[PDB]
Amino acid sequence: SHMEAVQNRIVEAAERVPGVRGVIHLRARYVGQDIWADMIIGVDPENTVEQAHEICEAVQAAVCGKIRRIESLHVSAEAR
Amino acid sequence: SHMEAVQNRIVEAAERVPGVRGVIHLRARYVGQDIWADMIIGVDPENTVEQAHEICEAVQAAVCGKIRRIESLHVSAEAR
């Protein structure tokens, strides 16, 4: 249901959040008309684990705010 | 094939690695006679992402060193 356009939006919205060093992985699927997705973002290896958690939270908020069809979004981080 | 005894060993071995603040989650399965497993360890929220990666690596090494039947082990971290 025009999945690539939604994936583009997800990556674009995540990259606009302070502290994100790219989108490493994104898997999105439709459950009916809703998107369920799992993402890994890059972060500064020198951020604290707490800071990385904060960035992930921020990404979840930004992405879900911008893309109303998302009903589930898990965001994790890795050093980049 | 005496899975609980192997799970106990996995958790015990992970908890002996410097920087581990418990085992948050462990899923192990047999693929034939071999174990494939995925684990989440707790770490100090004030560790850097790099330090958490180092701890995860150390856990993978310690666990696989001690439990020879493990053929695949993924270790991630979360603040605790």
Side-chain angles (χ1 to χ4, degrees):
Chain A
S1 333
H2 302 126
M3 179 63 93
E4 197 175 342
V6 175
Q7 295 165 287
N8 285 328
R9 287 167 65 202
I10 293 173
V11 171
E12 294 181 359
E15 299 187 330
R16 302 280 296 285
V17 177
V20 175
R21 301 184 168 191
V23 179
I24 292 171
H25 171 63
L26 169 69
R27 180 163 275 119
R29 291 318 175 27
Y30 275 107
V31 181
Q33 296 173 334
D34 295 338
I35 292 279
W36 291 42
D38 295 284
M39 181 185 284
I40 310 174
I41 58 163
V43 300
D44 179 355
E46 293 307 309
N47 282 355
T48 61
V49 169
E50 188 66 18
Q51 286 168 321
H53 169 67
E54 292 172 351
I55 299 165
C56 291
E57 289 188 294
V59 168
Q60 188 171 175
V63 171
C64 289
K66 283 171 179 194
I67 303 150
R68 302 331 288 231
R69 78 190 74 190
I70 299 176
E71 291 297 346
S72 180
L73 175 62
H74 186 249
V75 184
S76 67
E78 286 176 18
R80 212 45 110 251
Chain B
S1 333
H2 302 126
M3 179 63 93
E4 197 175 342
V6 175
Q7 295 165 287
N8 285 328
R9 287 167 65 202
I10 293 173
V11 171
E12 294 181 359
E15 299 187 330
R16 302 280 296 285
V17 177
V20 175
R21 301 184 168 191
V23 179
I24 292 171
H25 171 63
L26 169 69
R27 180 163 275 119
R29 291 318 175 27
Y30 275 107
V31 181
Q33 296 173 334
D34 295 338
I35 292 279
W36 291 42
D38 295 284
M39 181 185 284
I40 310 174
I41 58 163
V43 300
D44 179 355
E46 293 307 309
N47 282 355
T48 61
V49 169
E50 188 66 18
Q51 286 168 321
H53 169 67
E54 292 172 351
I55 299 165
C56 291
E57 289 188 294
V59 168
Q60 188 171 175
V63 171
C64 289
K66 283 171 179 194
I67 303 150
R68 302 331 288 231
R69 78 190 74 190
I70 299 176
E71 291 297 346
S72 180
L73 175 62
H74 186 249
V75 184
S76 67
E78 286 176 18
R80 212 45 110 251

